[PDB]
Amino acid sequence: TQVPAHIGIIMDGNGRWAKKRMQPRVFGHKAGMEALQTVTKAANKLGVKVITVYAFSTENRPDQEVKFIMNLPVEFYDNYVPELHANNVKIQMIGETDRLPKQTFEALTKAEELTKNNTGLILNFALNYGGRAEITQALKLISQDVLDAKINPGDITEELIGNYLFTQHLPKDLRDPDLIIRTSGELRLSNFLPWQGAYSELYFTDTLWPDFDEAALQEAILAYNRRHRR
């Protein structure tokens, strides 16, 4: 019904947005969570089934960014998740778990466990996530099953590989984003869903993430519907 089932979103520009206001970089990220809350809500009522969101930026000092990224789930569970539970939104994460702070692994699992029975939009958090890592990680699993004799080298196919990716937990007809949105004027994918997004439509905007709202989402959805005409 003229709505993309799965939207990927690269949330870029929090740092730049904060610098424009003469405010610290932390202030920018808190507004980014507000942006996400608005977008998550708006997308839920519009009919979108899945969104995979990705906190990525190149405006660094990696320790710093790899600091307030892992800090996201914590803050997001306290101030934003309760409302998203009220709106029937299901929360899941994709990415690597091993190197996570305890407190942020607690907030993520609690966010999942709170919302696991929810039947609305699936908000998918790409945290500590790299596309090439995802595929490599999937290759380890597949290779070990070939030695275990669970599958043959001939049995390895595009369809099979999909089941080993981090997006396997999603329903099979929704695993691949139909649209991928990137903000902050950057025309690149930065290792976001290389496999799953291989056939996706792309929307690039100069708008910074914290200024990206329901109106911005619809404008992106309008662009998408226009592509089908061409």
Ligand X SMILES: CC(C)Oc1ccc(CN(CCC(N)=O)C(=O)c2cnn(Cc3ccccc3)c2-c2ccc3sccc3c2)cc1
**Residue 47 site contact among ligand X, a second copy, none (CB < 5 to 8 Å, cut-off depends on kind):** none
Q: Give CA angle at 167 (204, 42), nearest 5°.
A: 50
> Which residues in the chain precede a discontinuity of more than 2.5 Å between C and N?
60
Residue 139 found at the interface with a second copy (CB under 8 A): yes
What's the distance, Cα to Cα, between the start and end of the chain in Å?
Answer: 18
Phi, psi dihedral angles at 6 (to 5 degrees): -135, 115
Examine the residue annotation and report whether 60 is marked as an active-site residue of this protein. Answer: yes
87 is in an annotated binding site: no
Residue 172 found at the interface with a second copy (CB under 8 A): no
Let me know: does 129 contact 189? Beta carbons within 8 Å.
no
CA distance 185 to 208: 8
Residue 157 found at the interface with a second copy (CB under 8 A): yes
**Residue 117 site contact among a second copy, ligand X, none (CB < 5 to 8 Å, cut-off depends on kind):** none
Q: Looking at 23, 83, 188, 215, which residue binds a second copy (CB under 8 A)?
A: 188
Q: Looking at 142, 211, 214, 219, which residue binds a second copy (CB under 8 A)?
A: 142
**Residue 67 site contact among ligand X, a second copy, none (CB < 5 to 8 Å, cut-off depends on kind):** none
Residue 19 found at the interface with a second copy (CB under 8 A): no
Active site members:
12, 60
